[PDB]
Structures are given as structure tokens and as C-alpha cells.
Design a protein around this ligand. Structure first.
Ligand code: W17
Length: 165
């Protein structure tokens, strides 16, 4: 299963790892994507996960959007995990750089509770503009299922572990 994770709480674990490499090695049941409402996987975790699927994630996502319309900020959808996982849970955290409500981060993490175990990034962190320390706090206070967080940046990983209350 997952290896080298530091245990933060009863159910939250964390590792300094590229979620793409973690997904390829583990092939978890669920990999979480840091999605936007349009499922346009252009950069950040989304661009990296999509590029690992050879764009199959984007092709599937465009068909999903053509049929269903955009997701809500704080919402999610379950699609294929392609070569990375059985499923990909596309979760839309608020993007602070697009002036979205940071209060929606708790709603976004609530989506994780529908899956017993997940490999995930910190929602709204990175190019989404939120404070990753705040995202980790909302994660451990909202997610009750088993979440294995992959933090790409080593310096940030150390900052998150060393400041975790
Ligand atoms: N895991 C990440 O946050 C991330 C962002 N870009 N990339 C490119 C290499 O996979 C990885």
C-alpha cells in the first residue's frame, strides 16, 4: 500500500512526493485531482495528472462537461483514474487567485468522505493560491476517511509537518 507517509492524525497521512509518481507506483483506488469547474487540466496538479494520462483525462473530462455542464466550486465528480488509479475524484477547491470564497474549502474536502481511502493533494494549495497550512488544517478537521496527502514541494512539506498542531 502507501509507504513513507508521516502519520498526522488517526486518518490523515502526509508525504513529500509528486502525486503523479505516487499514483503510478501505488495505483490507489482513488486519486484526487485539484480540478477547476470546467475540468480544464492545464497546470498544477491537474495538468500534471492529465499529462501522465497522455491527455486521456482531458478527453474524458470534456465529454463529461459537454454532457453535465461545469462542476460547482466545492463540488466534485468521479471519473476514470486511467493509468494512475481506479478512479479520479476531481475536486474543485476555491481558487483565491480567481477571487473565490476560501470558506468553500471545507465543502471541497467533504467530498473526500465519500471514499474510504484516497491519495490527494492539499486542496486550493499551489496555483490555487490558498495557504497550504490552512488547507491541511481544514483537511484534518473535515476528512474522516483515510487520506494520504502528497506534497510536491520539500520545503513546504517540512513547513507543514513542523507547524502542524
Ligand atoms: N504534484 C504536483 O503538485 C505537481 C505540479 N506539477 N508537477 C509536474 C510534475 O509531475 C507536479
Amino acid at each position: 500500500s502507501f509507504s513513507g507517509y508521516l502519520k498526522l492524525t488517526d486518518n490523515v497521512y502526509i508525504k513529500n512526493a509528486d502525486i503523479v509518481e505516487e499514483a503510478k507506483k501505488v495505483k490507489p483506488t482513488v486519486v484526487v485531482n485539484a480540478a477547476n469547474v470546467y475540468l480544464k487540466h492545464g497546470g498544477g496538479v491537474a495538468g500534471a495528472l492529465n499529462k501522465a494520462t497522455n491527455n486521456a483525462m482531458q478527453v474524458e473530462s470534456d465529454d463529461y462537461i459537454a454532457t453535465n455542464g461545469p462542476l460547482k466550486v466545492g463540488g466534485s465528480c468521479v471519473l476514470s483514474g486511467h493509468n494512475l488509479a481506479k478512479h479520479c475524484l476531481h475536486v474543485v477547491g476555491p481558487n483565491v487567485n480567481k477571487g473565490e470564497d476560501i470558506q468553500l474549502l471545507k465543502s471541497a474536502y467533504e467530498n473526500f468522505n465519500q471514499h474510504e481511502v484516497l491519495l490527494a493533494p492539499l486542496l486550493s494549495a499551489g496555483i490555487f493560491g490558498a495557504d497550504p497550512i490552512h488547507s491541511l488544517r481544514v483537511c484534518v478537521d473535515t476528512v474522516r476517511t483515510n487520506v494520504y496527502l502528497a506534497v510536491f514541494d520539500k520545503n513546504l512539506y517540512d513547513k507543514l509537518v513542523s507547524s502542524f498542531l
